[PDB]
Design a protein around this ligand. Structure first.
Ligand SMILES: CN(C)C(=O)c1cccc(-c2cn(C)c(=O)c3[nH]ccc23)c1
Ligand SMILES: [Ca+2]
Length: 139
């Protein structure tokens, strides 16, 4: 909710919508799998992920780092490797989603490096204030 977290999330959301979702034939990854359409999916995938869920997470500011966002991006790929196989066209398409994620992030490397540091400085200051305000039981 701070300016820096809002700017960080703004970059992640644009990478998802403008770049990752534009990969050709990426539609299997745009939304959660519906068991009515893929009956055995959740018998095999125990940690499902998709781009819409990532966008809901970005909206809630779940990610304060590239690494945490990229953990969920990578889950999409890993799940396709498990469910479809490493050589499936599903998995080739997932791989391209991940590649264009990494490539687009690199175009923002300096600014995202700074934003991650500034988010973490502000979180730490706010944590230390909240700890001190509780510890004195006066107010
Ligand atoms: C809401 N929609 C569009 C679906 O539930 C839907 C429909 C048709 C296919 C898929 C599908 C998705 N993903 C991620 C796969 O790895 C996969 N492997 C075989 C089919 C699929 C999902
Ligand atoms: Ca107090």
């Amino acid at each position: 909710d701070d300016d820096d977290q809002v700017a960080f999330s703004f970059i992640l959301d644009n990478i998802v919508t403008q770049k990752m979702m534009a990969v050709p034939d990426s539609w299997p990854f745009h939304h959660p799998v519906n068991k009515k359409f893929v009956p055995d999916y959740y018998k095999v995938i125990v940690n499902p992920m998709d781009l819409e869920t990532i966008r809901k997470n970005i909206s809630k500011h779940k990610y304060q780092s590239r690494e945490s966002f990229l953990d969920d991006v990578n889950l999409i790929l890993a799940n396709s490797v498990k469910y479809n196989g490493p050589e499936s066209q599903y998995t080739k398409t997932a791989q391209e989603i991940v590649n264009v994620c990494y490539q687009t992030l690199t175009e923002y490397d300096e600014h995202l490096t700074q934003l991650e540091k500034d988010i973490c400085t502000a979180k730490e200051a706010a944590l230390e204030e909240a700890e001190l305000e509780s510890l004195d039981p006066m107010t």
